[PDB]
Curated annotation (Swiss-Prot):
PROSITE patterns: TAT
Pfam families in the record: NMT1_2
Name by which UniProt lists this protein: Bicarbonate-binding protein CmpA
Keyword set, alphabetical order: Cell inner membrane, Cell membrane, Ion transport, Membrane, Signal, Transport
Amino acid sequence: MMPETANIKLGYIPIVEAAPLIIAQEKGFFAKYGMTGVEVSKQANWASARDNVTIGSQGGGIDGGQWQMPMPHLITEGIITNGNKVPMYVLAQLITQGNGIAVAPMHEGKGVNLDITKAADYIKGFNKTNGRKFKAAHTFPNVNQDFWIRYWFAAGGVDPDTDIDLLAVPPAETVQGMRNGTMDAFSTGDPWPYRIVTENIGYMAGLTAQIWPYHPEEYLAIRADWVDKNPKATKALLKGIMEAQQWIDDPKNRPEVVQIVSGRNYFNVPTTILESPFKGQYTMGDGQPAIDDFQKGPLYWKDGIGNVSYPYKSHDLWFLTESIRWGFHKNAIPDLDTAQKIIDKVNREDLWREAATEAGFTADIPSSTSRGVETFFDGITFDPANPSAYLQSLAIKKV
């Protein structure tokens, strides 16, 4: 099925979530299906990734790439691009887990761990007791990592909007702040946790693998105009990604995966900082036991619930439901019906199914577009069939 074109520019951020794109390219999986002209382009930050996909490859940007959710949806509706609507299609989930919340040393022994309920008053009154409002950061508002730390805070009784200072700050600057004693928490992901702990910059309150096991995370999304014009090439790219994900999850191949992504032309970091996490090994600190479980590390093809790669529409729904929870994009996404309408235009799980079928991976295709009821660490459940009930079960929200 000769692709219409063998070329495409896909952006990535130098974190473990990018692995499938890098491996599909470097191990020849894209080439196997005819996509011999794939350029895996490093993005400076999420803002730059957003801008680059808006201009497209022809304008000097990118045709698609790696994204935190629901960026593809927000770009499609021009919500985060000042009204410039650039339709995109979510084609596959790249990975699950590999994210976590780091906390500064000064908060050790205060109960600021996975469940911060007992430390809620300590956090809320930090200005009076310590001279500043508890300060936390993520690197881009209204997406994955902002959601993770907001859920963690709110589950313990801390309002992330009113009780603390939750800011969007570059990763290096944030870590520097933690070292300087001016930043209290950081919603981040591999390879950051290893460095933060080993360099005694802070400890890990919890992994997203603990907050929501096998949670939806990073996704591959490409501009709709590119996909509509190159349907065969799109499926070829999906097959390459699928094989790369399958390859990455075999423990035998992980040393090579680590070696490749850590290389100078990609992440450009010492392999040592990624070796442990790729084995599901994390030193958590604050007197808590270390984690040594492959199932708690990043997973790219299959997880404990189902297939990782398949993009369940129920997950798109959770991201937009949580957006509504925090009052994000009030005018653009005023209700759950509007959210579903956006999801039906953006999520292209049908192409994932088609590509998987053509490639001979029919045994791995999920039977539904929903992964069913989702369960969080605090007992809250999200039933895709009734997002209203989920929202109403939450203690802290803006709706």
